[PDB]
């Protein structure tokens, strides 16, 4: 995670959920990476 204690979950986070914040993030993370390349245009 980008705001965890060390690796997975934060000191104050939710480990008990099956949704999984790391898993949920990698879902959004790919959507972000796609949004960049599949619309490759900054502002010029």
General description of the model:
It is classed as translation. Keywords: guanine nucleotide exchange factor, translation. By secondary structure, the protein is mainly alpha-helical. Helices cover 39% and strands 0% of the residues. It has one helix and no strands. It has one helix at 21-37. The longest helix has 17 residues, at 21-37.
Query: Helical element count?
Result: 1
CA(first)-CA(last) distance: 33 Å
Rg computed from alpha carbons, rounded to a whole number of angstroms: 14 Å
Secondary structure class reads: mainly alpha
Global outline = elongated
- N to C succession of SSEs: H
| Estimated helix fraction | 25-40%
For the biggest sheet, the summary is:
none
Count structural domains.
1
Question: How would you summarize this macromolecular structure in one to three sentences?
Answer:
The protein has 44 residues and is mainly alpha-helical.
Break the fold down into its secondary structure elements and pairings.
Blueprint: H1 21-37
Provide tags for this entry.
translation, Elongation factor 1-delta, elongated, mainly alpha, 1 helix, 44 residues, monomeric, guanine nucleotide exchange factor
